[PDB]
Amino acid sequence: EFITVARPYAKAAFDFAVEHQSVERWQDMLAFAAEVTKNEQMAELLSGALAPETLAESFIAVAGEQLDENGQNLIRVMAENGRLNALPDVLEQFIHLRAVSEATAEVDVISAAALSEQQLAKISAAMEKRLSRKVKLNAKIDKSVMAGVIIRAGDMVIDGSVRGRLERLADVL
């Protein structure tokens, strides 16, 4: 695991994407590079002791659908230091950075039954007012909740499931 390695390259990439008005393109290009990172035979090549420049060219060759500024240079700079496995991490970092700048929160909810649109709309507005962002709710129908809902906004969470209240009363007892 190399989150901290991904943060420098991810900051460089994101800071560059807003200088050239192509955040939406940069995100999918980073996804493209991550898919290259996932390949079995490419992974063996990455495990080899090739020199960084020739390894970077072997990597570039399978990713011709990349721009000069974005792909050919970031791949080679990462290859100089062997941090190509950080591409998967850079992608997630890049998404979070974007969500910060655009004042958005990917608030996640879980429910024992499907919510009506009015209920979901009230929850959306209520979290936009609890927070200071445009929320984007996504729901999952899990019977483990038994009833009530879960609301997660990253690290923060609000639990309204009856299972939580049941076991809370059990711990009060």
Add this chain to the structure above:
Amino acid sequence: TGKIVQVIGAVVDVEFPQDAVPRVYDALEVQNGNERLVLEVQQQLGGGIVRTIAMGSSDGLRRGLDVKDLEHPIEVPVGKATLGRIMNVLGEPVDMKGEIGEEERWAIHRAAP
């Protein structure tokens, strides 16, 4: 053919092509300004980079200098010629007399009997 990539005190890192890397005790020669310096290989690192020891002063060495790969270890004169003379580690004459008239030179890395 190769280039210096690091200079750390007495040791120097040199990069060679992936198919033209010198052996573990081969000798290299570099031009430090107007004078020539001899480097001796110690370790083969990954990617064609080798660690070397400088047989001389290391000051003045810029990175990015080109090197020549000699295809033999350090060899010194031996025998009747080296019998009244003062000599350096590389087998060069140190007294201000002329050259050593040797018929044979031996590599200094040999095996015990």
Add this chain to the structure above:
Amino acid sequence: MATGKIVQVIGAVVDVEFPQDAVPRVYDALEVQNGNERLVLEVQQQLGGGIVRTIAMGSSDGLRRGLDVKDLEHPIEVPVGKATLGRIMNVLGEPVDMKGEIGEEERWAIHRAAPSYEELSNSQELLETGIKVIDLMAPFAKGGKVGLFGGAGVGKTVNMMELIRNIAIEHSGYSVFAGVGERTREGNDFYHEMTDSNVIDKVSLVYGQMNEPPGNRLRVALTGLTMAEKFRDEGRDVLLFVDNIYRYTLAGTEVSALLGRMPSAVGYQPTLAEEMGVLQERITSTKTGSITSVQAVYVPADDLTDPSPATTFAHLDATVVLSRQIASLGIYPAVDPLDSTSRQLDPLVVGQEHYDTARGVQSILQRYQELKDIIAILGMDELSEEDKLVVARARKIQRFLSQPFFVAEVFTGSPGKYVSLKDTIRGFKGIMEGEYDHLPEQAFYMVGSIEEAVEKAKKL
């Protein structure tokens, strides 16, 4: 089905990668086929995404990267009960005596918590032993811990064999012997001795020897404690003999660095105190049953300053300190009467007479030690006549501490002696009061009661 794969084999430490759901938890067991050999791994750390770092309970040789691993969802579990009596077992509770299956009714996990504070039971039921100096300087009670401290070759094993003979035979309850890091020959000799004496039917034996990889030497003590605690929970009084606590700590030290830990003061692991405490707080006498334990403690370089003996001093009721100095001088057992003590040596717990006798002996020998160098450099006749009387009585007392053992009969060529506590008190009281001032020094050397001293004096 198999669920994990090996990714690193560094020395004795193995890393296994699992799916990020259902990762094995700490102190679990895992299984892998090392060729035809079934090999058990014990999980020690949950680290990174889906990876656990483990210790092999067997030889790590023959392992390849990419081998499948099957995760058993329980810790290492061992047979417990009457079926373990009279059988030799390894760390995993597998028979190594070639008598067949154990035949157990119940199996118990070797990792378990210590008794709660209110479960503890207080006891002052003094045990009597035949050894003079131990009963005099450090008497101990049923349900307590005893530790025999000593350097290399000072008499730990001989004393423990003598104590087994003296205590266990009168004891009617079951006993457990945990051979932590023992020499193979001495384990075989112990097994055959018990088999001949017909006391093997009430002893359970767990042996993890010097040749085995570090995990076995690390966990064999816990196996022994598990068996002893089964007997304790049945309500019986148990005798637990542990051959070396030192090599439990040392088996920890060998693998500590490979687990990613930063080294401690003297190269030990950073977790020495906790690793000692978790093991040694389980060896207690609760209200349901009592465990009485005797432990042999190695002293590196014969220096009691080392952290291992230093920390294990703080865990024991009675500590018999053997010294290489007294062993080199030829006095056997080599107990140091000035250093050895017991917390049962109270005028309330023991006879008031007993307490005064012990205090007087210690005072006299302490006074001799300061005069040793004085006399050595300046001469015997520089002393006052009272000082010369004190010197005489000191040498006689320091002879009377010696004793022949039944199990130390092969080394010396003499019969073994057993002395009752009352006789020991009477003899030392007589010596200090001067009733035997006129006997020579050897009249007290290597004898039993003081009546035997006067008999040998007549022969002298």
Add this chain to the structure above:
Amino acid sequence: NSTEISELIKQRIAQFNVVSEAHNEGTIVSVSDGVIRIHGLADAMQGEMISLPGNRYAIALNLERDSVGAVVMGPYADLAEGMK
């Protein structure tokens, strides 16, 4: 385009004709002071004897991830990178 793009990567990698190390084979990637590092060699046991060029043999003592650390039994100044 998950399936499409993964197929695209597969076909370009196959057309490039790059290939995995064969199991029970590897390449030396570092030689230093009688100790060598080897890439590949998946089916390598700890304590196994690995055959070097020549009749020399090496003991594989350390099985790291993406590397095998071995000790040369004899003179080592003749070895280099790229050796199978």
